[PDB]
Amino acid sequence: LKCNKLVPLFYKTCPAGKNLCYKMFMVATPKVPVKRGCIDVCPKSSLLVKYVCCNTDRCN
């Protein structure tokens, strides 16, 4: 699996066990992702922080 990094023109290959890509962002500014990469479990979205997870190449 491949996922994009903070600057989406750059990407990486996930290590074993991380079969999800993710994009994190502050709920009030959803067009500015503050973090991106590979993860194993999709983090729990809270009141102020939202996470979008997906499982296909450079989907985040």
Ligand X SMILES: CCCCCCCCCCCCC/C=C/[C@@H](O)[C@H](CO[C@@H]1O[C@H](CO)[C@H](O)[C@H](OS(=O)(=O)O)[C@H]1O)NC(=O)[C@H](O)CCCCCCCCCCCCCCCCCCCCCC
Ligand Y SMILES: CCCCCCCCCCOCCOCCOCCOCCOCCOCCO
For residue 8, the minimal CB distance to ligand X (Å) is: 11
The upper half-sphere exposure of residue 6, i.e. CA atoms within 13 Å in the direction of its Cβ, equals 2
**Site residues (vs ligand Y, CB under 6 A):** 5-8, 10-13, 27-28, 30, 33, 44-47, 50
DSSP sequence for 2-15: EEE-SSTTSEEEPP
CA–CA separation, 42 and 10 (whole Å): 21
43 is in the binding site of which of ligand X, ligand Y, none (Cβ under 5 to 8 A by kind)?
none
- Applying CB under 6 A, does 9 fall inside the site for ligand X? no
Give the residues lining the site for ligand X (CB under 6 A): 5, 12, 15-18, 36-39
